Design a protein around this ligand. Structure first.
Ligand SMILES: O=C(O)c1ccc(-c2ccc(C(=S)NCc3ccc(-c4ccnn4-c4ccc(Cl)c(Cl)c4)cc3)c(Cl)c2)o1
Length: 123
């Protein structure tokens, strides 16, 4: 409804990246999804997600969630609640968020636009 950005967990991206808050179950919007160059493994999907305030491109789907993308329930513009995730840190210091369980609250067709004007999270 009205006040669309009120549907999203504003501040969750900063909470995840800094505090390392993991007990939260934030509601985020999918902005973009794309497959990763994998080789001969099942595909991996990388997601650009928004909390209304920030976007962050360092999300990856657990392979068990691949059917959500492949059967088109999880697509750009949909709004999801993250129920389980972990943060990992690469050798170079970059952090990545692995989404393990999520729920689609509103399909892409029911939302239809990028909500608000989120800006890229820095670090
Ligand atoms: O069920 C499962 O699939 C499951 C359970 C636990 C895990 C799981 C555990 C650890 C990892 C990690 S950080 N692998 C490191 C990894 C690092 C880079 C990559 C990777 C390959 C191409 N791009 N790219 C990349 C680079 C930068 C960022 Cl910010 C992102 Cl989001 C992706 C691919 C993998 C990943 Cl990807 C998944 O997966």
């Amino acid at each position: 409804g009205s006040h669309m950005v009120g549907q999203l967990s504003r501040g969750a991206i900063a909470a995840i990246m800094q505090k390392g808050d993991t007990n939260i179950k934030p509601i985020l919007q999918v902005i973009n999804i794309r497959p990763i160059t994998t080789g001969n493994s099942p595909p991996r999907y990388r997601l650009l997600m928004s909390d209304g305030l920030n976007t962050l491109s360092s999300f990856m789907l657990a392979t068990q969630l691949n059917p959500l993308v492949e059967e088109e329930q999880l697509s750009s513009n949909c709004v999801c609640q993250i129920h389980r995730f972990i943060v990992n840190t690469l050798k170079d210091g970059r952090r990545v968020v692995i989404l393990m369980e999520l729920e689609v609250l509103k399909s892409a067709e029911a939302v239809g636009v990028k909500i608000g004007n989120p800006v890229p999270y820095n670090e």
